[PDB]
Symmetry: C3
C-alpha cells in the first residue's frame, strides 16, 4: 500500500585536537565526514493485509559521504534489512536488525538522538550509536503492542551454523511512555561475537553483554534525560572487562529553528583490579533551514584518567587515541534528509 | 516509456537436521535466511522506439536478508545487469545474464518455480536455481520472436581477455508452448570457468557443461512436469565427473490462496568408475495473504548412497554435509514482493 | 523540492587488435563492456530554501554492465557522493567529488564529451576520463556564481588522518563561456596519492599534478576544440615523470540524429632523459534512436614510438599493452539513459 525511498546526507568538517601519528607525537586530525548522523539511504514499505495485519519491510544502507563506501561492516543493507508482519497483538520481523539496546536505551541518550557520533560513549562501548556496526544478523524480533504506554520485546540472533552458540545473540527490553516522560531498560548478550561470517555479529572470544536503564522528560522547548549502561566482556582465562557509562543530557529550543544541546558522560572501565575513566562534555547548536535541512556546530571535550588516553568516538574505531589525557573535537556540518512516498 | 523499481524479500527460519561440526559430529543447523526465493531489488525499463522496436534494461541485485550482504559473487548487480533492443524479429541484450539453461529448463523445475532454494538438485549441480552465482558475465544474448509457440535463442559470454577461450561460455535453448503444455531443451558450455576476474564465470580447469530437456502441463488448479538435466566436467588428466538429475514435480491449488507442491529428484553422479546417488523429496504449503505477500511451510528429505553423505542445497555451497546419509530441512517463512511503476 | 533517479547503461562489443598474452605473443581482445560512457545509476536532488539558497546532493554509482560489479575503486557511490548549499554567491559542496580538472578541462576533450573511454589519453594519464577512479575523497568544493560568463572554483581534499599531507589533494580552475565559445584552465595537485584508505585518493610516493588549458567552439551542427594537459609525478630519489597531451577534436551532426566525431591526440612522456610518445586518432558515428537511446560505432588507432608499446585506454588500467607499436580498437554499442523526476 506504500513504498518509500528515503535517506540522510550528513557531511561536516571536524577538527580533533590530538591524534597520535606513527612518529608517536600528537597532531590535529582534520576530516570531512558524517558529523551527527551516519549518511544512509533506504527503502521501506507497509502493505495493509486487513484486520489490523500489515506486511512491513525496511532495507537501509549506511555509507561514508567522504569516500562513497559502505560502512557498518561493508555489506549492502548494513544498517537494517528485514521483513515482517505487524498486527494488533505485536510485530514479528526477520533479518538484520538493531536489538533491544537500540530500541529502548538509545532514545534516552544524546548520541542516539540529537547528538550523534561524537556524543557516543568511549569506543561506542555500549553500542548506543549506530554510526558503527551495531546491528545483529539473522535476527527474529518481537515487539509488543502498546499496553497503555508499556511496550516490550526482544530478539534472538541465530549463528546460522551447526555450532548453535558460536556467534549468536539475544536481547530484551521494555519502555514506558506517558505525556513526555519516557523510561527504558534493556539487556543484550552475545556469545562468540564476530567469530565467523555466518553468525549474529560481523567480524571485528566469549560472552559480551550490554544492559542499562534510564529515563527522559520532554515538555515545551525543553527535554532532558539520564541514562546508565554497562558493557561487559567475560567468560574469555583472560580477565573480565567491564565499562559503566553514566550520562545526563538536555536540549533546549531557543527558537523553533535553533536547538542547543548539552551532554555529559562519565565512563569507568575496570579490568584485573585496575581502573580507567573518562569525562566527556559536549555542546551542539543546530539550526534548521527547513524541515529537511539543518546546519550544526558543536564542540566535545574529553579527559581521561592519567593511566589512559582520550579518544572521542568519531565513527572509526581504528582512529588512534590522543597522546595525552585530553582531546577536543569540533565540527561544523550540513545535514539533508530526502523522502519520496510514491503516490 | 516506463521505469519500474521492484524487489522480493524472503525470510524464514530453517532447521537442517544434521550438519557436520568441526568436531566431526552431526548437529542441527538453525538459520534465518531466504526460504524460497533469494531476496533481491531491481530496476527495469522499456522505451518505445517505434515500429515494434523497444529499448529494454534490467538491473537486479540479490542479497541476504539475514546479514544485508550481496551474494551471487558479491557484486552490485549480481543477478542480472543488461541493456538491449527488442523488435518483432527478436531481442538482443548485452551484459551479465542468465543463460539458456535458466531461460528454458528452470521453468520446468520446482527449484526454478514454486519450490526455490531447498528444492534445488544436489550442490545446485545443474545451475537451475538462482539462489547462487549462476549468471554469466560479458554475455550477448539473442531471443527469437514467438513463432506460433516456438521460441529459441542462445548466448555467447566473452572472456574479456586476450586468451579468447580462457573463462568464456555459450548456450542455446528452445521452448514450445501451447495451452498449458510447455516443452524445453537447453545446452550450455563453459571453458575454464572461474579462472579469472574478467571472464564469463565468477571465481568459485577445463570444460563444464549442462544440458537437459523436460516438459510440464498446467490446467486449472493442477500443474506438473518432468525434467532431466546433466552436468558434466571434462577435459580437465583428472577424471571426468558427470551428474544426471531426474525430477518430477506437481503443484495443486487447494484454494485460490493455498498451493501445495511436491517434488522428487533422483541424482546420480559418476567419476572414475564409481557412482554416488541421492534421492530427494519435498513438500511445500504456500498461503497467499495478498497478491504481494505469502507465508510458506515446507519440509525436504534427502537420502544419499552409503558411499556418500546427504546435503540439501540451502543457498550456500560452503555448508558442510550431513555426517550421515540422511538430512531433513524444514522451513517456515515470509515472502513479500514490492513494485513501483513511476506513472 | 525534487529528487531524481537516473542512470546510463552503455554496453558494446569491442575488438582490440593486439593485447599481450602470458605467452608473450599478441592476440586480439574481444570484450563486452562500456563503450562510450561508464554505466551508472544515481540519486540527485535540490531543495528550495528561499532567497536564492538551495540544498543540493548527488549520489552516483558507477558499475560494469558486463559483470554487474562496482568499479572506480569498488565503493558504493564511487563516482560522486556529496551534499551542499547553492546560493547567488556560489556553491559549497562536501563529499567525494570530481576536481577542477574534471569541471573545467574534461568538457574540452573528446574523452570527456562525445568520445568517452577509448578516446582517453594514454593510461588516462591526465585523469580526464571518468571511466576510471578519478574522483577525490573528503573534498570541500567551492564553485563561483556566473560573472558574465566567467566561472571559477576549487577543491581541498582532506587526508582524514593525523598526517595532514599524507594522501590529500587540492585543485583550482576557471572557465569563460560566450555564445558557443568555451575556454578553460585548471590545476590539480595530490600529495602521497593512494597511500592509505582514509585520504583523498583511493589506493592504486610523492607529488602528482595535472594542469592544462584549452578552448572549444560550437555553432550549428559543428563543434571542435583544442586542449593541452600535463600530468607530472615528482618529489618521489626516483626520477620525475611527466606526460604532455595535445588534443584536437571536431564533431559534426550530419542529421539531427547522426553525429560524427574525430579526435587526434599526441602524447609525449619524459623520464630521466628518455622520451616516449603516442599518436592516437579515432572516429565515432553515433545515431540517436530517441532522446534516451543511441547506437554508436567507432574505431581508434594508436601508434607509439619504437621504444614503447601501444595501448588504447579501455577503462581497465590492468589491461596489458600491445606487443607492437600499434593497436586498433573498434566498438559497436548501445547506450540508454533513464530518468524519473518523482512529481
Ligand atoms: O522473538 C525472540 C525474542 O526472544 C528473546 C529471548 O531470548 C531467547 C532466550 O535466550 C536466552 C538464553 O538462551
Ligand atoms: O547471440 C549469440 C548466441 O549464439 C550462441 C552460439 O554460440 C556461439 C558458437 O559457439 C560454439 C563454439 O564456439
Ligand atoms: O574550497 C576550498 C578550495 O580552495 C582551493 C585552494 O586550495 C587550498 C590551498 O592549498 C594550496 C597549498 O596548500
Ligand atoms: Na500523479
Ligand atoms: Na521512485
Amino acid at each position: 500500500s506504500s513504498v518509500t525511498l528515503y535517506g540522510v546526507l550528513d557531511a561536516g568538517i571536524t577538527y580533533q585536537s590530538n591524534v597520535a601519528t606513527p612518529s608517536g607525537s600528537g597532531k590535529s586530525l582534520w576530516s570531512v565526514g558524517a558529523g551527527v548522523d551516519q549518511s544512509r539511504f533506504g527503502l521501506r514499505g507497509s502493505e495493509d493485509l486487513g484486520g489490523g495485519l500489515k506486511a512491513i519491510f525496511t532495507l537501509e544502507s549506511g555509507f561514508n559521504i567522504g569516500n562513497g563506501r559502505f560502512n557498518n561492516g561493508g555489506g549492502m543493507f548494513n544498517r537494517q534489512a528485514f521483513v515482517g508482519l505487524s498486527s494488533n497483538y505485536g510485530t514479528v520481523t526477520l533479518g538484520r536488525q538493531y536489538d533491544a539496546t537500540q530500541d529502548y536505551l538509545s532514545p534516552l541518550s544524546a548520541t542516539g538522538t540529537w547528538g550523534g557520533t561524537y556524543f557516543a560513549h568511549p569506543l561506542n562501548n555500549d553500542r548506543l550509536n549506530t554510526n558503527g556496526d551495531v546491528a545483529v544478523n539473522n535476527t527474529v524480533k518481537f515487539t509488543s503492542a502498546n499496553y497503555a504506554g508499556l511496550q516490550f520485546g526482544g530478539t534472538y540472533s541465530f549463528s546460522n551454523n551447526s555450532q548453535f552458540a558460536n556467534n549468536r545473540a539475544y536481547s530484551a527490553g521494555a519502555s514506558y511512555q506517558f505525556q513526555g516522560l519516557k523510561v527504558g531498560a534493556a539487556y543484550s548478550q552475545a556469545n562468540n561475537a564476530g567469530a565467523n561470517t555466518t553468525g549474529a555479529t560481523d567480524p571485528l572470544q566469549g560472552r559480551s553483554r550490554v544492559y542499562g536503564a534510564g529515563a527522559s522528560y520532554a515538555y515545551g522547548p525543553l527535554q532532558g534525560g539520564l541514562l546508565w549502561t554497562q558493557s561487559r566482556l567475560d567468560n574469555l582465562g583472560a580477565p573480565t572487562i567491564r565499562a559503566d557509562n553514566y550520562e545526563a543530557n538536555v536540549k533546549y529550543n531557543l527558537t523553533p529553528a535553533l536547538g542547543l544541546g548539552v551532554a555529559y558522560t562519565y565512563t569507568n572501565a575496570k579490568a584485573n583490579g585496575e581502573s580507567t575513566h573518562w569525562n566527556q562534555v559536549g555542546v551542539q547548536a543546530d539550526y534548521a533551514l527547513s524541515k529537511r535541512t539543518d546546519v550544526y556546530a558543536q564542540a566535545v571535550y574529553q579527559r581521561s584518567s592519567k593511566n589512559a588516553n582520550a579518544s572521542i568516538y568519531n565513527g572509526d574505531l581504528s582512529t588512534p587515541f590522543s597522546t595525552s589525557i585530553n582531546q577536543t573535537a569540533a565540527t561544523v556540518g550540513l545535514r539533508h534528509r530526502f523522502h519520496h512516498h510514491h503516490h
